[PDB]
Structure 1
Amino acid sequence: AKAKTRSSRAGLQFPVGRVHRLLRKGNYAERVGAGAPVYLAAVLEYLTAEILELAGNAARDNKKTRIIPRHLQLAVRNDEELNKLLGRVTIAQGGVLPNIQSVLLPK
């Protein structure tokens, strides 16, 4: 019969075959279920979509049409949930979030 990929018949965009292969050949457990790759692919797709939407918002805010590591940095640090999730990473070439302490400003 004609073969249809698990990504398509699950409705996702991330690969499910590759995720299943990594889960097997990654020494995570002896046996890997059949819904685990689907669930993991869905979660990864969701997180990617969320962060990319915020980054695109920032890039449009700065009158540009290409997301750059600066926009990734800026979106991540401005969203508090993503900031907690990525609290320890350092996006290379991201700069820093603009902030001056109130006391330092002139009278």
Structure 2
Amino acid sequence: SAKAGLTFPVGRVHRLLRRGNYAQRIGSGAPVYLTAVLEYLAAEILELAGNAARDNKKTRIIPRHLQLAIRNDDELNKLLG
């Protein structure tokens, strides 16, 4: 994570994916890619929650604003069920 300022670490995700034993060997780009995609989708939700908070006219964040944001986003609804 400290190579080029990446946020999420590689060891934790690597051991989490190794505990499932989904494959015999892990590719070199798989950990960095998954850290990248995961953090991106997390932000997609945090920023949505934030705008819902701004929509609430309150800088604070509570799960009600998150629920409003997820319900508003139809594609996010389909992705998250």
TM-score (norm 2): 0.89
Q: Counterpart of 1:39?
A: 33
Alpha-carbon distance in 1 for matches of 2:76, 2:2: 28
Local SS of the residue matching 1:50? helix
Larger radius of gyration between Structure 1 and Structure 2 = 1
Provide structure 1 residue ranges, at least 5 long, that are not aligned to the other structure: 1-6, 88-107
Work out which of the residue numbers 39, 54, 75 in structure 1 matches 2:48. 54
The percentage of aligned residue pairs carrying the same residue is: 86
Q: Which amino acid aligns with 2:64?
A: R
Return structure 1 stretches of 4+ with deviation > 2 angstroms: none
Q: Work out the CA distance in 2 between the residues paired with 1:22 and 1:43.
A: 16
User: By percentage of residues, which structure has more helix?
Assistant: 2
Q: How many equivalent pairs are there?
A: 81
Which ranges of structure 2 fall in alignment gaps of 5 or more residues?
Answer: none
The one-letter amino acid paired with 1:66 is R
Q: Is 1:23–1:32's contact at 8 Å kept on the other side of the alignment?
A: no
